[PDB]
Structures are given as structure tokens and as C-alpha cells.
């Protein structure tokens, strides 16, 4: 096919004539084997500035045509009532499509399922966003990209599985949480929802543990979605312990000199039952006195020794007093 000067139809508009005929695997003078113009046709797209590349022969003339990837005119944001044109903008900006650079219309659907992406990254869990362009003067173009938004989901049936102790409802009874939000605190994506939740999820363990239930575990806490991205379902997956009775406390540790009192404010009534309130409610009084006596920040945690043989827990509480500190 021996070639000469080889032409380039118009394709060029932003590229350089001269980058361009680098990039082409085939010098002019080269002797064209049609598996070659195809090898031609794959370099060129390589570069990837172009949507569209051909390469036709003539009288020993290779023409090759090219429509030229477009540029990014203007980014613009329509429907998008709930996310400031500047965190989308950003966002865009992220994957890849800045104001300025090319266009490639392949990625269209990505564009969307991206922002439509970034729409679960909220709350908005199903919600549309169309991709749609405008061919503009200079190879520019438009892009308007509209924003069906989306119904926020909610939290709308907690369930609750692994109790026998305790009816599967007066565990629940007490939960502060509703399949909705009151006067438009703070909750931004649901944070209200969440603090609320776990706050909910730590009165199920008070309960079980106020109650003799030493390993007492919220093994996981199962969340799913509707089929209809409707709402959400909360599950808990309980595994409640045996109950167990006290036998003694022993508050250990750097007790300041007052392990006579300290530890006469630990006693027990032996026919008593673990009891996880019971225990903070002690450390505390512990933190009190220690603190009385000039100590702000005394440290103390009590790990229970649960004895399964005798089914029976130990209180091993420690107490570091904390450094009295002197004006």
C-alpha cells in the first residue's frame, strides 16, 4: 500500500496535527498492510482524545478522519434540592469531569450511577439522575445533569431475635426512635437516627445486664433495606447469657488510702444478682470519693469474672486514683 502524504481530514481542532501524525504507528513511506491501518485505528483511539477515528486509503494518501472528543462548556445542576451545586460540582469533579477537559459520551450512564451513587452516599438510597448534554459552538458542549432527588428512607420496624428470657415487646417498649425525625435538629444523614439507635441498642444490653445476665452479647446488629428501597429493617441478634449471682467484689489498684472506705462502699447481701447498673452505679461512688478527696481524674473499670461452673460472677474492679493535684 506504500504510502505518501498522508492527510488528516478535520478531525483536528484541539489536537496538534503534529502529536497526532506522531502517534500513528505507520510513517509515510511505511508500506501499509491493511492489519496495519486497524493497528492505526486503535493507536489513534489509544490517545483518547477523539469519540470517533478514521483511516481510509486513496491514492497512496491516508486520510485519517476524526471526530474530536468534545469539551466541557458548562456543568450544570438542575433539580438537585438538597445538595449544594458545589458538593456535586466537587464530586464530578472527583470522577473525573472537570469544567474544562473532554467528554467522552461512553461514560454517560457511569456519570449518572455515580452521582446516583453519590445520592446513596447520603440518604437519598434511590433516586435518579439524567445525563443530558447540548451540542455547542466551538466542539464545546453543555451539560445539564437533572436531578429527580429521592424520598429519604426510615428506620421502620426494629426486630429482635435470640430472646426467651423476655418477651420479644418489653424489650423494645422503652426505645426512643420513631420511623421519623422531630423538629430538624442535626440529623444531616441520619446521625440523629444513628446516636438514637445506638442509644435504643445500649438500653436492650442495660436491661439483660441490670438483670443478671452477665454475657449478655448484641452479636450483630442485621440491618437490610426494602425490596422498594421502601424503608429500613433493623434487626438485633441477641444471645442472652445465663443469669449469675454475685460472690464478692475486690476493688484492687491504687486506692489513695482509702480502701477502708472505698471498700466498705462495696458490699453485696451474697443471695444478690449481677447487676451492670448496680456496678457503674458504684464506680461512680468511688469516683466521688476519691474526687472529694482531690482526685479529678481517678481511673476505674471493673471486669466481671464469670464463673460458669457455680454460675456465679467475681467484680474485679480497679481503682487508680488520680494525681491530687496542689495550688
Same mark, same amino acid.
Given at each position: 500500500?506504500?504510502? !505518501?502524504?498522508?492527510?488528516?481530514?478535520?478531525?483536528?481542532?484541539?489536537?496538534?496535527? %503534529?502529536?497526532?501524525?506522531?502517534?500513528?504507528?505507520? /510513517?509515510? %513511506?511505511?508500506?501499509?498492510?491493511? =492489519?496495519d491501518?486497524?493497528?492505526?485505528?486503535?493507536a489513534?483511539?489509544?490517545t %483518547?482524545?477523539?469519540?470517533?477515528?478514521?483511516?481510509?486509503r486513496?491514492?497512496?494518501? #491516508?486520510?485519517?478522519?476524526?471526530?474530536?472528543?468534545?469539551?466541557?462548556?458548562?456543568?450544570?445542576? +438542575?433539580?438537585?434540592? +438538597?445538595?449544594?451545586?458545589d458538593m456535586?460540582?466537587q464530586n464530578?469533579?472527583a470522577?473525573? !469531569?472537570?469544567?474544562? =477537559?473532554? #467528554?467522552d459520551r461512553?461514560?454517560?450512564?457511569?456519570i449518572?450511577?455515580?452521582?446516583?451513587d453519590?445520592?446513596?452516599?447520603? %440518604?437519598k438510597?434511590?433516586?435518579?439522575?439524567?445525563?443530558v448534554?447540548?451540542?455547542?459552538?466551538?466542539n /464545546?458542549?453543555?451539560?445539564?445533569?437533572?436531578?429527580?432527588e429521592?424520598?429519604?428512607?426510615?428506620?421502620?420496624?426494629?426486630?429482635i431475635?435470640?430472646n426467651?428470657?423476655?418477651?420479644?415487646?418489653?424489650?423494645i417498649?422503652?426505645?426512643?426512635? /420513631?420511623?421519623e425525625?422531630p423538629?430538624?435538629?442535626?440529623?444531616?444523614?441520619?446521625?440523629?437516627?444513628?446516636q438514637k439507635?445506638?442509644?435504643?441498642?445500649?438500653? &436492650?444490653?442495660?436491661?439483660?445486664?441490670?438483670?443478671?445476665?452477665?454475657?449478655?452479647?448484641?452479636?450483630?446488629?442485621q440491618?437490610?433495606?426494602?425490596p422498594?428501597?421502601?424503608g429500613?429493617?433493623?434487626?438485633?441478634?441477641?444471645?442472652?447469657?445465663?443469669?449469675?449471682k #454475685?460472690?464478692? !467484689?475486690?476493688?484492687?489498684?491504687?486506692?489513695a488510702?482509702?480502701?477502708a472506705?472505698?471498700?466498705?462502699?462495696?458490699?453485696?447481701?451474697?443471695?444478690?444478682?449481677?447487676?451492670?447498673?448496680?456496678?457503674?452505679?458504684?464506680?461512680?461512688?468511688?469516683?466521688?470519693?476519691?474526687?472529694?478527696?482531690?482526685?479529678?481524674?481517678?481511673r476505674?473499670? +471493673?471486669?466481671?469474672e464469670?464463673n460458669?461452673?457455680?454460675?456465679?460472677?467475681? &467484680?474485679?474492679?480497679? !481503682?487508680?486514683?488520680?494525681?491530687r493535684?496542689?495550688?
Amino acid at each position: 500500500g506504500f504510502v !505518501v502524504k498522508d492527510i488528516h481530514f478535520e478531525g483536528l481542532q484541539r489536537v496538534a496535527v %503534529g502529536a497526532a501524525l506522531l502517534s500513528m504507528p505507520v /510513517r509515510t %513511506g511505511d508500506t501499509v498492510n491493511d =492489519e496495519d491501518i486497524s493497528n492505526t485505528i486503535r493507536a489513534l483511539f489509544a490517545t %483518547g482524545n477523539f469519540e470517533d477515528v478514521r483511516v481510509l486509503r486513496d491514492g497512496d494518501t #491516508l486520510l485519517v478522519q476524526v471526530k474530536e472528543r468534545p469539551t466541557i462548556a458548562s456543568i450544570t445542576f +438542575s433539580g438537585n434540592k +438538597s445538595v449544594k451545586d458545589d458538593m456535586l460540582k466537587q464530586n464530578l469533579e472527583a470522577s473525573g !469531569v472537570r469544567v474544562g =477537559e473532554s #467528554l467522552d459520551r461512553t461514560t454517560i450512564a457511569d456519570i449518572e450511577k455515580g452521582l446516583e451513587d453519590f445520592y446513596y452516599s447520603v %440518604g437519598k438510597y434511590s433516586a435518579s439522575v439524567k445525563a443530558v448534554v447540548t451540542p455547542l459552538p466551538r466542539n /464545546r458542549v453543555d451539560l445539564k445533569l437533572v436531578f429527580q432527588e429521592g424520598v429519604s428512607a426510615e428506620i421502620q420496624q426494629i426486630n429482635i431475635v435470640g430472646n426467651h428470657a423476655f418477651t420479644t415487646d418489653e424489650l423494645i417498649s422503652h426505645f426512643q426512635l /420513631r420511623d421519623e425525625v422531630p423538629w430538624w435538629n442535626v440529623v444531616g444523614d441520619r446521625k440523629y437516627q444513628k446516636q438514637k439507635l445506638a442509644g435504643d441498642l445500649e438500653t &436492650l444490653r442495660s436491661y439483660y445486664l441490670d438483670r443478671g445476665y452477665a454475657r449478655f452479647n448484641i452479636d450483630s446488629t442485621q440491618v437490610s433495606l426494602t425490596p422498594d428501597k421502601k424503608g429500613i429493617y433493623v434487626t438485633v441478634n441477641i444471645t442472652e447469657g445465663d443469669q449469675y449471682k #454475685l460472690s464478692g !467484689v475486690e476493688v484492687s489498684g491504687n486506692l489513695a488510702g482509702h480502701s477502708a472506705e472505698i471498700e466498705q462502699l462495696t458490699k453485696i447481701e451474697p443471695g444478690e444478682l449481677y447487676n451492670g447498673t448496680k456496678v457503674t452505679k458504684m464506680e461512680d461512688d468511688i469516683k466521688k470519693l476519691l474526687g472529694r478527696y482531690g482526685y479529678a481524674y481517678p481511673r476505674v473499670q +471493673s471486669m466481671p469474672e464469670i464463673n460458669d461452673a457455680d454460675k456465679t460472677v467475681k &467484680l474485679r474492679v480497679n !481503682v487508680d486514683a488520680g494525681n491530687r493535684f496542689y495550688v
